[PDB]
Amino acid sequence: SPIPVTVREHKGCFYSTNPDTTVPIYGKTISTPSDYMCGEFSDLLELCKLPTFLGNPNTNNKRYPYFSATNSVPATSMVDYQVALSCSCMANSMLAAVARNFNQYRGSLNFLFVFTGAAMVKGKFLIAYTPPGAGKPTTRDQAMQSTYAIWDLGLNSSFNFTAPFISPTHYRQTSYTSPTITSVDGWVTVWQLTPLTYPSGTPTNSDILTLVSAGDDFTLRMPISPTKWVPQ
């Protein structure tokens, strides 16, 4: 005997992200095993925590990977890239590349800097994250009053930095720059606190290699799908 049913309003709708199965066609069909293939990653996060390389520009617009420095005085230095997980820098990077196919982010970020100069060399860099409120620093002095770390160039090749999450909101938008709205936040700067020194027989000039990552605190949530491109 038939069960009366009240057909609901929708009735012939197809939902794209609809959490529930549909009907088979080819069953009791066994799949070709795996077994022998190591290297299965279940979560994406566990990805965007592998530095990939932030490309630093020069006139030809030929960005290239190094922050590059010498003998003396900056400037307002060495660099400056903001922390707007959509920047020019971080995009192309995994974290930033992954962070994008997601609507929101939270947690602490990490910037790692590896020196590439001669071993007979020696330098000393100041590094800082300066939160939005006032403006982009325009002098180390102005910078230092922010979360930073004086990097001493020695044996130990690379430094690990990590710019927190100084955020009102428990979360932030992964970046879609219909303008710059209030939410987004960050600038990280870096300048030498003593010049980069070197004896006779060694180079003036030296390049130091850039690599973003998402810490032990990084969280991306709300899948989405960006912005149709077709590169170059």
Binding site: P19, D20, T21, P24, G27, T29, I30, S31, P33, D35
Partner: protein
């Protein structure tokens, strides 16, 4: 936690074997 986007309390009618893919590990004549 659960499969991915797949969350109804009634899970599968058919038979796993039937909805996704098994999954696996490596008469007579007479005289």
């Amino acid at each position: 936690n659960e499969s991915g986007n797949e969350g109804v309390i009634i899970n599968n009618f058919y038979s796993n074997q039937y909805q996704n893919s098994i999954d696996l590990s490596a008469l007579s004549n007479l005289l």
